[PDB]
Write an enzyme that holds these catalytic residues in place. Structure first.
Site, PDB file in Angstrom:
ATOM      1  N   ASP A 132       0.831  -1.219   0.000  1.00 12.21           N
ATOM      2  CA  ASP A 132       0.000   0.000   0.000  1.00 12.21           C
ATOM      3  C   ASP A 132       0.851   1.248   0.000  1.00 12.21           C
ATOM      4  OD1 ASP A 132      -2.282  -1.616   0.184  1.00 12.21           O
ATOM      5  OD2 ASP A 132      -2.195  -1.609   2.374  1.00 12.21           O
ATOM      6  N   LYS A 134       2.228   4.599  -0.972  1.00 14.52           N
ATOM      7  CA  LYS A 134       1.643   5.766  -1.607  1.00 14.52           C
ATOM      8  C   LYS A 134       2.295   7.005  -0.994  1.00 14.52           C
ATOM      9  CE  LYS A 134      -2.353   5.111   1.360  1.00 14.52           C
ATOM     10  NZ  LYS A 134      -1.706   3.832   1.762  1.00 14.52           N
ATOM     11  N   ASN A 137       2.387   7.643   2.771  1.00 14.19           N
ATOM     12  CA  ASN A 137       3.279   6.773   3.562  1.00 14.19           C
ATOM     13  C   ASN A 137       4.743   7.203   3.537  1.00 14.19           C
ATOM     14  OD1 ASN A 137       1.133   4.280   2.470  1.00 14.19           O
ATOM     15  ND2 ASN A 137       1.429   4.718   4.641  1.00 14.19           N
ATOM     16  N   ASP A 153       4.223   2.149   7.631  1.00 21.67           N
ATOM     17  CA  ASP A 153       3.219   1.095   7.407  1.00 21.67           C
ATOM     18  C   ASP A 153       3.743  -0.169   6.714  1.00 21.67           C
ATOM     19  OD1 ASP A 153       1.089   2.308   8.797  1.00 21.67           O
ATOM     20  OD2 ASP A 153       0.260   3.222   6.978  1.00 21.67           O
ATOM     21  N   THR A 172      -5.766   5.403  -2.571  1.00 25.48           N
ATOM     22  CA  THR A 172      -5.229   4.042  -2.731  1.00 25.48           C
ATOM     23  C   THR A 172      -5.200   3.561  -4.192  1.00 25.48           C
ATOM     24  OG1 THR A 172      -5.377   1.685  -2.050  1.00 25.48           O
ATOM     25  CG2 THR A 172      -7.442   2.880  -2.247  1.00 25.48           C
TER      26      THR A 172
HETATM   27  C1  LIG Z   1       1.419  11.305   9.446  1.00 26.36           C
HETATM   28  C2  LIG Z   1       0.759  10.526  10.589  1.00 26.36           C
HETATM   29  C3  LIG Z   1       0.249  11.487  11.660  1.00 26.36           C
HETATM   30  C4  LIG Z   1      -0.390   9.694  10.011  1.00 26.36           C
HETATM   31  N1  LIG Z   1       1.777   9.601  11.188  1.00 26.36           N
HETATM   32  N2  LIG Z   1       1.639   8.373  11.215  1.00 26.36           N
HETATM   33  C5  LIG Z   1       2.688   7.796  11.792  1.00 26.36           C
HETATM   34  C6  LIG Z   1       2.818   6.426  11.979  1.00 26.36           C
HETATM   35  C7  LIG Z   1       2.565   5.605  10.885  1.00 26.36           C
HETATM   36  C8  LIG Z   1       2.635   4.228  10.988  1.00 26.36           C
HETATM   37  C9  LIG Z   1       2.942   3.646  12.193  1.00 26.36           C
HETATM   38  C10 LIG Z   1       3.011   2.265  12.264  1.00 26.36           C
HETATM   39  C11 LIG Z   1       3.326   1.665  13.477  1.00 26.36           C
HETATM   40  C12 LIG Z   1       3.558   2.465  14.591  1.00 26.36           C
HETATM   41  C13 LIG Z   1       3.492   3.856  14.517  1.00 26.36           C
HETATM   42  C14 LIG Z   1       3.173   4.455  13.314  1.00 26.36           C
HETATM   43  C15 LIG Z   1       3.105   5.843  13.215  1.00 26.36           C
HETATM   44  C16 LIG Z   1       3.583   8.812  12.146  1.00 26.36           C
HETATM   45  C17 LIG Z   1       4.835   8.924  12.759  1.00 26.36           C
HETATM   46  N3  LIG Z   1       5.508   7.863  13.170  1.00 26.36           N
HETATM   47  N4  LIG Z   1       5.383  10.144  12.934  1.00 26.36           N
HETATM   48  C18 LIG Z   1       4.726  11.233  12.521  1.00 26.36           C
HETATM   49  N5  LIG Z   1       3.535  11.161  11.933  1.00 26.36           N
HETATM   50  C19 LIG Z   1       2.944   9.974  11.730  1.00 26.36           C
END
Ligand SMILES: CC(C)(C)n1nc(-c2ccc3ccccc3c2)c2c(N)ncnc21
Length: 462
Positions: A132, A134, A137, A153, A172
């Site tokens: 996924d 994109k 991500n 992700d 997506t």
């Molecule tokens: C953009 C926004 C708010 C959706 N975002 N999202 C993350 C984020 C994404 C995937 C993850 C997977 C497993 C554990 C923590 C995670 C945190 C994330 C991050 N680390 N840092 C900053 N922003 C983040």
């Protein structure tokens, strides 16, 4: 003794929403370490694998390390949720940095794609597929100009079933590899998606596009694209050769991520150190991103109005039950237990899972409405303020996205723009046109913010 997420981390604020759940900024209660915690609701997200294989994957993910892959630190599970604790990045989404730039060249594109391919290569070496991939991500590690991209992700889609709801599905369809649609897929799908992103970086347009999600998917499945747009004459032949190799239909014939890192284009455009700016691409990307974010915001706003209809009557029923005398009066502690109950079952606010956080939220609501926290309180008024607060916050959030989209500060969105927005939002054409006819009673062919907002309310049963 099973470890509990709330015993170790306190929520600081909500960072945003991504695949599978909300992401909260949290802080270790002992060490002060800040982290980003993805909170996945077991009620709303089905697992594709058994408990066993998820734990194993988590264990592997925690040991992996690469400058272009999000670092995962910890994993918790309770009765309602999974909590994935990773490193916080502050640079925001890549495309949101790109559109702010004055200039953008094949050198900047190549440096971006090298990072992405480097991370992918590393994850593929460890038998992890994204599926996924994109633009949303791709986060920037910090707000520094030279900031590294961190892919988020990786590995989640293997274990968790993607949402079927459009508010979760925005974007997506442009990036999904055809073989993913048909069911037999492997790590090469990530190369396809990266090829799509590259195509967009260099032209600012998706290679597979359409007026709605299904039309996009039909184009993806056919697999045909052209480089016949005017943007493409500014672009080197080697970039288009790499894109071709990454958008090769049969995955066995498609270039691997590691081989893509050796491609002429990456080698030429990322070396030590005159390349022209891709101005039309930036313009196109600006427009593409703006549209995606407004459609996202519109869906979010409609969902928030529906959540409010749900939660406002439930909270009232919870307090009515607690109110033994029928006098309408509850104390702070009772308001807290009532609000706690609401939050546990609904799971629409990941920041409200900790009891201390609910105590704080009630005090914010009480402090807003000039009610003394130490006496008995009219709960019907607390319910109104607590929900009105949320309703105001949702409206303000939509407005900011409306203003963002309206790049010329016209104050209006044209009928042509609505068509594109609702198409991205997969709101049926006859349906929004019909709602537009009820709101635009004078055939102006445009709507201001209030009118746009009214359309969205009408498009979620109000
Ligand atoms: C953009 C926004 C708010 C959706 N975002 N999202 C993350 C984020 C994404 C995937 C993850 C997977 C497993 C554990 C923590 C995670 C945190 C994330 C991050 N680390 N840092 C900053 N922003 C983040």
């Amino acid at each position: 003794s099973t470890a509990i997420f709330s015993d170790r981390y306190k929520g600081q604020r909500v960072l945003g929403k991504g695949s599978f759940g909300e992401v909260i900024l949290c802080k270790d209660k002992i060490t002060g370490q800040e982290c980003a915690v993805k909170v996945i609701s077991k009620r709303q997200v089905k697992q594709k694998t058994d408990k066993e294989s998820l734990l194993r994957e988590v264990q592997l993910l925690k040991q992996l390390d690469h400058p272009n892959i999000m670092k995962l630190y910890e994993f918790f599970e309770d009765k309602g949720y999974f909590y994935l604790v990773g490193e916080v990045y502050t640079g925001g989404e890549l495309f949101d940095e790109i559109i702010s730039r004055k200039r953008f060249s094949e050198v900047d594109a190549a440096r971006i794609i090298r990072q992405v391919l480097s991370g992918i290569t590393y994850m593929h070496k460890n038998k992890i597929v994204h599926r996924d991939l994109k633009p949303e991500n791709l986060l920037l590690e910090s707000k520094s100009k030279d900031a590294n991209i961190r892919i988020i992700d990786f590995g989640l889609s293997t274990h968790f079933e993607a949402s079927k709801k459009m508010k979760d599905k925005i974007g997506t369809a442009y990036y999904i590899a055809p073989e993913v649609l048909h069911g037999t897929y492997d790590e090469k799908c990530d190369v396809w998606s990266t090829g799509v992103i590259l195509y967009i970086l260099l032209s600012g347009c998706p290679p597979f596009n359409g007026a709605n999600e299904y039309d996009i998917l039909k184009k993806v499945e056919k697999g045909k694209y052209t480089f016949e747009l005017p943007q493409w004459k500014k672009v080197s032949e080697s970039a288009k050769d790499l894109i071709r190799k990454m958008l090769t239909y049969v995955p066995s014939m498609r270039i691997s991520a590691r081989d893509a890192l050796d491609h002429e284009w990456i080698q030429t455009y990322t070396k030590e150190q005159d390349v022209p700016s891709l101005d039309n691409a930036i313009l196109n990307i600006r427009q593409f991103q703006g549209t995606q974010k407004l459609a996202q915001a519109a869906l979010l706003y409609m969902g928030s109005k529906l959540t409010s209809q749900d939660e406002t009557k439930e909270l009232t029923a919870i307090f009515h039950k607690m109110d033994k005398n029928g006098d309408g009066q509850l104390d702070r502690a009772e308001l807290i237990e009532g609000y706690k109950e609401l939050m546990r079952m609904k799971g629409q606010d990941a920041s409200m899972l900790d009891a201390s956080a609910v105590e704080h939220e009630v005090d914010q609501v009480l402090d807003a409405v000039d009610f003394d926290k130490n006496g008995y309180i009219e709960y019907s008024e607390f319910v109104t303020v607590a929900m009105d607060r949320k309703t105001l916050l949702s409206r303000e959030r939509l407005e900011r996205a409306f203003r963002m989209f309206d790049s010329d500060n016209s104050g209006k969105i044209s009928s042509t723009e609505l068509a594109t927005i609702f198409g991205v939002s997969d709101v049926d054409s006859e349906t929004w046109k019909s709602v537009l006819s009820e709101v635009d009673k004078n055939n102006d062919g445009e709507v201001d913010f209030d009118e746009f907002q009214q359309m969205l309310l009408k498009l979620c049963g109000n």
